């Protein structure tokens, strides 16, 4: 018997119940393979993984956002090429999802889900404030809704400022809307002014404008994502900019374990910015998966091809958790919120991975730092963009 060790960041009890049913079914069909799930919370996982991956504690499989850290881990010899064990994965999973975890023709992981960041909002609170949530198409209209919420005594936005990345969603989306795909593509290539260019300075200017309305809950810089999602679930703030995984999370984090029920819940895309080059259909989000650590056993690919199969992924869509990557598993997207989100993802010409993950731990950490820094007044919009560009130039210099 051999044990496949899979490190993950999942907290939801319904999801874990489904994962356990899949693992039980797999172990019954493969009596010589055991599956050990190893949980670490999101922030702890990102902080601890570098040490664990470079040690003899490394697992076979670990949760991954792809992006810059995945690229560097591959070039550092920290991952295992499973191309020779990928025949079934390539049959059953989306080609774009498989490509997200392939480097230099080597299959270093497999996709698990795709996501969109957007504004979850409370229709009950919006009605109290006299806001039609479906009518918010532009950034100016969004700011007007913020002012209407404040006038009604309702905290407009819950944000997990302590974790920083929830605030970076604002800066990133504003940069996407201001500059469009080409401004970002050019910055990635270090062309022109790069991340110090006008679209990124405008992103900071618009984030500072939002911050000047004081739209966040008191003490937001001390709140992590769990606390912020709980505020939304408890009807204590009207708006939550978050990935689509928030749907189940705000319910679990609510005192009543239900949160904002479907009859009170809305979701809207990030609005357009007047004069901006970005399209309202452009999406910020991710393609997340499981990477193979160096030394991963062949049984780990056997597990992943079952865990990621059409039936398994259909179950996880049907419990409202993931937008799946397995072919045909979109049949499980029965929930109206998740169905519409999956359509936005499918239709997007530009589906951009989270800036903090695309740019790697160092430069992405700078983006996270300047996002809260602009809001708190510690850096100006120009200085923020300058810091991102300077850090990015050094990352380019020091990597292949
Ligand atoms: O760096 C952050 C990631 O930490 C964040 O990951 C999310 C966190 O919320 C849930 O735990 C979800 O399962 C994770 O994938 O994703 C956005 C990125 O900017």
Residue numbers in the entry: 27 to 426
How did the manuscript describe this experimental structure?
To reveal the mechanism by which XylC preferentially binds β-1,3-XOs, the crystal structures of XylC in complex with β-1,3X2, β-1,3X3, and β-1,4X2, separately, were solved. The three structures are highly similar with root mean square deviations (RMSDs) of 0.18 ~ 0.23 Å. The binding pocket of XylC is L-shaped. In β-1,4-XO-binding proteins, however, the pockets are arc-shaped to accommodate the nearly linear β-1,4-XOs. In the structure of XylC-β-1,4X2, a ~ 45° deviation of xylose 2 was indeed observed compared to that in XylC-β-1,3X3 and XylC-β-1,3X2. The deviation results in the absence or increased distances of hydrogen bonds to Asn68, Trp91, and Asn314, which explains the poor binding affinities of XylC to β-1,4X2. Among all the tested XOs, XylC displayed the highest affinity to β-1,3X4 with a Kd (dissociation constant) value of 1.0 μM, but no binding to β-1,4X4. Its binding affinities to β-1,3X2 and β-1,3X3 were 5.5 times and 29.9 times that of β-1,4X2 and β-1,4X3, respectively, and no binding was detected to xylose.
The pathway starts with the extracellular decomposition of β-1,3-xylan by two β-1,3-xylanases into β-1,3-xylooligomers, which are mainly internalized by an ATP-binding cassette transporter. The substrate binding protein of this transporter has an L-shaped substrate binding pocket to preferentially bind β-1,3-xylooligomers. XylC comprises two domains (domains I and II) with the substrate bound between the two domains, similar to other SBPs of ABC transporters.
